[PDB]
């Protein structure tokens, strides 16, 4: 369970980190992460939120 | 902010179960129970001629 940064060799001399694309179904803790987010202001009014 | 509980107080509104003071000689208000208890027993005027 390590996070490895992929390195690729550029044309002249260098070796830069590059990122691969991921789908939203790929990340394994994304849904818990967005669930754990809490609104800053009033979360709910009289047990109701959103368009109040 | 946060979870807010709102009732008729913070909006300064009358409660659903609220009653006003009974009317006085110079005040306007509810009609008292014993006023009606006096009214109903008061027989209606008799219409003769
Ligand atoms: Fe009223």
Q: How far is CA B3 from CA A28, B6, B8, B44, in A?
A: 31, 10, 17, 59
C-alpha B1 chain-centroid distance: 37
Q: What is the resolution of this structure in A?
A: 3.3
Residue B46 Cα to ligand 1 middle (Å): 37
Question: Which chain B residues are within 8 Å of A43, Cβ to Cβ?
Answer: 2-3
Q: Which of A40, A34, A51, A2 is nearest to B2 (CA)?
A: A40
B12 marked among binding-site residues: no
CA–CA gap between residue A31 and residue A43 (Å, rounded): 19
């Amino acid at each position: 369970t390590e996070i490895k940064r992929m390195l690729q060799t550029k044309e002249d001399n260098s070796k830069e980190q590059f990122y691969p694309e991921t789908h939203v179904a790929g990340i394994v803790g994304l849904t818990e992460y967005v669930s754990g987010q809490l609104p800053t202001g009033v979360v709910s009014v009289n047990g109701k939120a959103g368009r109040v | 902010a946060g979870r807010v509980l709102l009732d008729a107080e913070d909006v300064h509104a009358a409660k659903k179960s609220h009653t006003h003071e009974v009317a006085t000689y110079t005040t306007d208000g509810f009609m008292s129970s014993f006023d009606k208890q006096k009214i109903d027993q008061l027989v209606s005027p008799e219409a003769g001629v």
